Nucleic acid binder design. Structure first.
Ligand SMILES: [Zn+2]
Length: 58
DNA sequence: AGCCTTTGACCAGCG
DNA sequence: TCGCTGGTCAAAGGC
């Protein structure tokens, strides 16, 4: 999606099967992080973005 | 070296 | 207070 991310965890939530993976924008000081649930088919079923990139893309 | 993913255990916050 | 649940740490390993 055009940004750089570093994974920092994966948990298995309630009700929804697919596990959830947490990532953090790797830009210096950038605080955006996101959480991701993908289907068994590898399709994005849910993305939460928590912040906004005060920087340009790479 | 430096950066990433995996993994298991710890944090908090709310009911 | 307790303990489940989602969010995070950080070590151990891979690249
Ligand atoms: Zn960013």
């Amino acid at each position: 999606d055009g940004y750089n991310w570093r994974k920092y965890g994966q948990k298995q939530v309630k009700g929804s099967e697919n596990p959830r993976s947490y990532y953090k924008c790797t830009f210096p000081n950038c605080p955006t992080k996101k959480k991701v649930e993908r289907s068994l088919e590898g399709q994005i079923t849910e993305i939460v973005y928590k912040g906004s990139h005060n920087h340009p893309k790479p």
